[PDB]
Amino acid sequence: LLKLFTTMELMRWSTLVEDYGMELRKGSLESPATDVFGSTEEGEKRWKDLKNRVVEHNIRIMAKYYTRITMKRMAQLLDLSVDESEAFLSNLVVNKTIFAKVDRLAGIINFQRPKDPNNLLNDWSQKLNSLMSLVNKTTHLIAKEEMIHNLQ
Amino acid sequence: AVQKVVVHPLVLLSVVDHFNRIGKVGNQKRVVGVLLGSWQKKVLDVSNSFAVPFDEDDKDDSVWFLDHDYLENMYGMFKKVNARERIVGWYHTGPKLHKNDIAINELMKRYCPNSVLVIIDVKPKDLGLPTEAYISVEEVHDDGTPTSKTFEHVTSEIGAEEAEEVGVEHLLRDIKDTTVGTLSQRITNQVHGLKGLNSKLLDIRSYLEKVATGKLPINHQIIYQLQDVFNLLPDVSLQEFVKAFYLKTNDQMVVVYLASLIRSVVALHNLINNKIANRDAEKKEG
Amino acid sequence: LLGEIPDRLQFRQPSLKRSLMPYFLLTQAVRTGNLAKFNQVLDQFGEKFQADGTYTLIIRLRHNVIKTGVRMISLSYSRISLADIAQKLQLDSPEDAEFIVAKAIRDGVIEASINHEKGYVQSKEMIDIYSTREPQLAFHQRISFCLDIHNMSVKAMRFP
Amino acid sequence: FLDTVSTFTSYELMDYKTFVTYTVYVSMIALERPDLREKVIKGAEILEVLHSLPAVRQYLFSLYECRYSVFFQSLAVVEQEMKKDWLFAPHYRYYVREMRIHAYSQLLESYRSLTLGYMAEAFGVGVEFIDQELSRFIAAGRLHCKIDKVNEIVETNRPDSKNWQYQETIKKGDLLLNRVQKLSRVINM
Amino acid sequence: ILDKKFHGILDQGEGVLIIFDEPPVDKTYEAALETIQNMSKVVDSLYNKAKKLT
């Protein structure tokens, strides 16, 4: 349960079914699998809702790593057809949880970033941030220069 | 505990004027005194201090004495005039530290939980913002030595105060301030390459010396670690700017555009108005 | 002779009008690529040109107008076929059109590629001139022009 | 002409309905599309007189409807009044293609890539007519655009928001600063 | 796009509608339009110029 929530990455959804398919036979207490998987009409909704947990948690980490992705690569990553991806692309984007630009002609799609007008942050994080580590060299270098030259 | 210290030119002079005190009578060692710190927060500040007669024998390299009758009653003096001022540690002019300096701090820890020592310099030479600061902790060691007491460098910075710049900043009178925006930033650039790349060569020659001799320091590992943080861009042949190439000139995009746009209308303000007022006086006079 | 000119009556004066009438319709036939209209201007208005001594250009201005006519079409279209521009500019033949476009590339006038089978000419939009390139590089001559006038104003100010 | 009915009808104002025709024919060029529909719809006294004429009111709303099939018909009806009316003889020549570019402005702004066969639909049917027509618009500086020939593609463009829009500074500023260069050498002498 | 209610552009061949709000106008009209006014500064000063000289 918590393993999918922390650090994410990827796992075959059937392997999660292998673990959560034994909870029907597990027990002792079958009541957790009763209210959930015991009811047919309530389970099928929560089964597809369980899909919404595993497929969107990929979209959450993938939105951080894009950049870009091909449409065919998303199918093997989400472990379903490209059409089910388009359905998961439509229902997640109307919730506006992740901004996405989807081009179906060439298959190249991506999650964010908004068109890259950015100018300041490109130059500022370059000059300010990175060079601060570059100008801090001699600061702590003479600190360690005292360390090595006092003993040796 | 103590992260950074603030050393005023007034208290630093209290070490320098005592260099005239015992400098004329000599003989060996240096100027040493007890430091009065002002601690309002984790950042340390120093306002005043009192210099005490001190000597360190050579032979006998481990021998040192403060005068503690000078330390006790004179504290009640400065405490009576200034309640906030208290002793945070000691100081000396160095220039370097002999091994005996381990025992000076541990003795006065009865006065302050952690006594910060300040190495100062009476004759400014190199390489930059002067003096120095150390803090007394125990890191032991990785090799398994008995518990090792070694002073860790504390970054020192000069700071100002109200009413103290009256006589101090008056006597110079020869400085040009600044001028911010034209010469101020560019002189730094010529020095940023000088002072930036000289320590680059001084250390890279000592880092090559490691393999040769002087090993340890291994270091380890701090040397290459932050050097690899410097390695986000090397920048080596050639500049690896293929992504930053169009962005290079694109940062100069508007800077050149405005410089082209401002100088056009600034001229229209300078050229027109000059011609107007000139011919009004020039030709109407004769 | 530049190839780019507007109608010159914007420079006309009521006193200069009567004198420029034979020279007026001339440039009006330069904006068009018709030979029958251009040759009729030379026949009737050639008498006024005798006093100016400008006959040197009339032989090379025919080659100038055909560059203006093709520039009008090449700037108005992405692709321009040699057979469609043949009679539209009335070059009348495919072979001399291959000679003109060849010399047009030699003079840097046209960027058009040509696919020779019958043949035809297939061009494409020229771009990448963009922003960061031409304006800021031209501004080097603009400011150097302006900063010299700053000295011209100071020099003129020093005399009084 | 914004005064409209405040002048009412006078011996020197002739027929006010004809004065409505005079102001409506200039209002399809000078009065921009956002303000074109505004003055007629939001304007009270001017709206009743245009609804009385079905020919003018049609062409007004059809201009906002953007259909190009009824333009060449209705614009000729306006041109008939423009031909048979005095003082409009010198001024109808530029009026013709100025209402075309007014309809063609919104046209090419719609799509970045447009096929002229799709324009043949609306024009009914432009094939070689708009070939030389739209070409003679670009050469005169009206609606700069790139229309591909035999490839049946129109390209939009031209991004005037950045580059060419800068050129008004220095170009008008050249003869400006030149005028004060020469006149600077005059002082003194 | 003409009514400004929608900012974007279509694709007729491949059938993909692209929306871009990108192309701002900020620095430019704030420059050239002020220079057009500066044309009235010199022309109106041309009266002062020619009057004092001759």
Curated annotation (Swiss-Prot), chain B:
Domain of life: Eukaryota
GO molecular function per UniProt: protein homodimerization activity
Keyword Acetylation part of the UniProt annotation: yes
Keyword terms: Acetylation, Isopeptide bond, Proteasome, Ubl conjugation
Numbered residues of crosslink Glycyl lysine isopeptide (Lys-Gly) (interchain with G-Cter in ubiquitin): K176
S-S pairs: none
Cellular-component GO terms for this entry: cytosol; extracellular exosome; extracellular region; ficolin-1-rich granule lumen; membrane; nucleoplasm; nucleus; proteasome complex
Pfam families registered for this protein in UniProt: JAB, MitMem_reg
Residue span(s) of domain MPN: 5-140
Keyword Acetylation among UniProt keywords: yes
Gene Ontology process terms (BP): proteasome-mediated ubiquitin-dependent protein catabolic process
InterPro entries documented for this protein: EIF3F/CSN6-like_C, JAMM/MPN+_dom, MPN, MPN_RPN7_8
Modified-residue entries (N6-acetyllysine), positions: K200, K210
Family under the similarity heading: Belongs to the peptidase M67A family.
Subunit comment: Component of the 19S proteasome regulatory particle complex. The 26S proteasome consists of a 20S core particle (CP) and two 19S regulatory subunits (RP). The regulatory particle is made of a lid composed of 9 subunits including PSMD7, a base containing 6 ATPases and few additional components. Within the complex, PSMD7 interacts with subunit PSMD4 through their respective MPN domain. Interacts with TRIM5.
Miscellaneous notes: Does not bind a metal ion.
Protein name: 26S proteasome non-ATPase regulatory subunit 7
Organism: Homo sapiens (Human)
Swiss-Prot record, chain C:
Domain of life from the UniProt record: Eukaryota
Annotated signal sequence range: none
In-chain residues carrying the UniProt-annotated modification Phosphoserine: S81, S93
Domain PCI: residue ranges: 1-128
Protein function: Component of the 26S proteasome, a multiprotein complex involved in the ATP-dependent degradation of ubiquitinated proteins. This complex plays a key role in the maintenance of protein homeostasis by removing misfolded or damaged proteins, which could impair cellular functions, and by removing proteins whose functions are no longer required. Therefore, the proteasome participates in numerous cellular processes, including cell cycle progression, apoptosis, or DNA damage repair.
Subunit structure: Component of the 19S proteasome regulatory particle complex. The 26S proteasome consists of a 20S core particle (CP) and two 19S regulatory subunits (RP). The regulatory particle is made of a lid composed of 9 subunits including PSMD3, a base containing 6 ATPases and few additional components. Interacts with UBQLN1 (via ubiquitin-like domain). Interacts with ERCC6.
Family: Belongs to the proteasome subunit S3 family.
UniProt protein name: 26S proteasome non-ATPase regulatory subunit 3
Protein's gene: PSMD3
Whole-protein coverage range: 338 to 497 of 534
UniProtKB/Swiss-Prot annotation, chain D:
Function, as annotated: Component of the 26S proteasome, a multiprotein complex involved in the ATP-dependent degradation of ubiquitinated proteins. This complex plays a key role in the maintenance of protein homeostasis by removing misfolded or damaged proteins, which could impair cellular functions, and by removing proteins whose functions are no longer required. Therefore, the proteasome participates in numerous cellular processes, including cell cycle progression, apoptosis, or DNA damage repair.
Protein name from the UniProt record: 26S proteasome non-ATPase regulatory subunit 6
Subunit (UniProt): Component of the 19S proteasome regulatory particle complex. The 26S proteasome consists of a 20S core particle (CP) and two 19S regulatory subunits (RP). The regulatory particle is made of a lid composed of 9 subunits including PSMD6, a base containing 6 ATPases and few additional components.
Domain PCI, first and last residues per copy: 1-161
Organism: Homo sapiens
Family, similarity comment: Belongs to the proteasome subunit S10 family.
Swiss-Prot record, chain E:
Inducing or repressing factors: By FOXO4; expression in embryonic stem cells (ESCs) is mediated by FOXO4.
Modification after translation: Phosphorylated by AMPK.
UniProt note on tissues of expression: Highly expressed in embryonic stem cells (ESCs). Expression decreases as ESCs differentiate.
Superkingdom as given in the UniProt entry: Eukaryota
Subunit structure: Component of the 19S proteasome regulatory particle complex. The 26S proteasome consists of a 20S core particle (CP) and two 19S regulatory subunits (RP). The regulatory particle is made of a lid composed of 9 subunits including PSMD11, a base containing 6 ATPases and few additional components.
Function, as annotated: Component of the 26S proteasome, a multiprotein complex involved in the ATP-dependent degradation of ubiquitinated proteins. This complex plays a key role in the maintenance of protein homeostasis by removing misfolded or damaged proteins, which could impair cellular functions, and by removing proteins whose functions are no longer required. Therefore, the proteasome participates in numerous cellular processes, including cell cycle progression, apoptosis, or DNA damage repair. In the complex, PSMD11 is required for proteasome assembly.
Record-stated family: Belongs to the proteasome subunit S9 family.
Name listed for the protein in its UniProt record: 26S proteasome non-ATPase regulatory subunit 11
Organism: Homo sapiens (Human)
Gene label: PSMD11
